[PDB]
Design a protein around this ligand. Sequence first.
Ligand code: CL
Lengths: 248, 251
Amino acid sequence: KDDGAYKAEPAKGELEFKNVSFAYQGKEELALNNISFSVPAGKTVALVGRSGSGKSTIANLVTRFYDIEQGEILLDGVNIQDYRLSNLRENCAVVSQQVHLFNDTIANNIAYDKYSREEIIAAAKAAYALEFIEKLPQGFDTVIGENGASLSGGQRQRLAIARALLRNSPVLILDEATTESERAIQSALEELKKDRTVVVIAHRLSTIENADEILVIDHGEIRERGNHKTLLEQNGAYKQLHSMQFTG
Amino acid sequence: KDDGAYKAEPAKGELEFKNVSFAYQGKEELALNNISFSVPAGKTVALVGRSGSGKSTIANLVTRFYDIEQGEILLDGVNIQDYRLSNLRENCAVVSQQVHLFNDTIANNIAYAAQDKYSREEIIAAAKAAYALEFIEKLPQGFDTVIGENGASLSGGQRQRLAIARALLRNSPVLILDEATTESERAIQSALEELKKDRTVVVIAHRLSTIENADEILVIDHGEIRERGNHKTLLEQNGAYKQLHSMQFTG
Ligand SMILES: [Cl-]
């Protein structure tokens, strides 16, 4: 599995899927069928589509959660399978509700290459988490409880963003859920998304409407491609999903 | 990190903490202070206590989420650090507040579990024992149903039972169960009673049914074990357990 010996320190962040097909183990039918798209370094691409579309499979493949046998996924023009897995994962950070927190200090949860307290604070500030952390009796040295359940969900999402900002990965995979601090998160995500390549499993209207490109995934294929304005003009699948607020 | 060359295939499941102390990196204060307890193979031990107690740190240490430098944690009398990490993790399964699910079939999500491959028949047996068979078989594609949104297509009760099925399939001799402080709550309680049979169980506990049926309860308070017993012996003491129990383990 971890056969690759090549590394990018850091990668510029250019992504490309070229003729990618994928089927789950034990299934003949394809989950993804001849997927091709390119994301220039520093751009944001929102994957939208109904549940079951395969949009999440596309995102999962970027970090080799599973490998393909047909087509290629390239990072800076090199097949992702050719990179040392640890380096691929260092270059491509994931943010999802599945962010693992654990009993330890807030600082250590953010730091989970060593970073200084200064660097950790800067990451929390950019993530709109500094204000709630510093008001706490012990600040960054506060020990979280119940492996993260002591914090609110909005607080947990911002720690996940801080953790991502600290690593400063050139590629970000953001999985949006279909919040009391929602405004703060949107600003935090706008900071996280700046100067890096972002692939979003998207549900927020603000994320989608501001993406450089939107790919509408439908039964394992790309049905429509454009941005919010060009896709609305088409009066097709994007426009309909948008009307229903990406709740499909 | 993964310096150990020893393996148990499988371990019997005897656990022991002997004089264990632990502090988070960069902290002077101890998170756990001179923790000592034994769990004979096949017994269930419930760790109870208020948020911040360190009960979850105890559970996290069993699978080497972090390592100690004072005292020892032993599996079948061998320090956990001496086992190949992959084998320690094969012997000690975790049912976490949040189990990692992903776009793929229900069967592949259940099988994600162990090192060796399992048959469809073995996967079905695991789902049955976990009270997940009925909801999976009523579905249009049954076990071949592809979950969506990396698990969000399923209900939370359904996701917990898949985590239990996943644990039953690997049949690990040690189970670490983290209870959250449900529409299919009854089904889960029976599923957990199946999962807890014939294996060593360490529970970060909140359910009254789990706690009242544990072989031993350890009340953790500010990084120390304050009380030890079972539901009946601890109630007799009219102390910390009784008070926590009176508030339904919501602390
Ligand atoms: Cl420092």
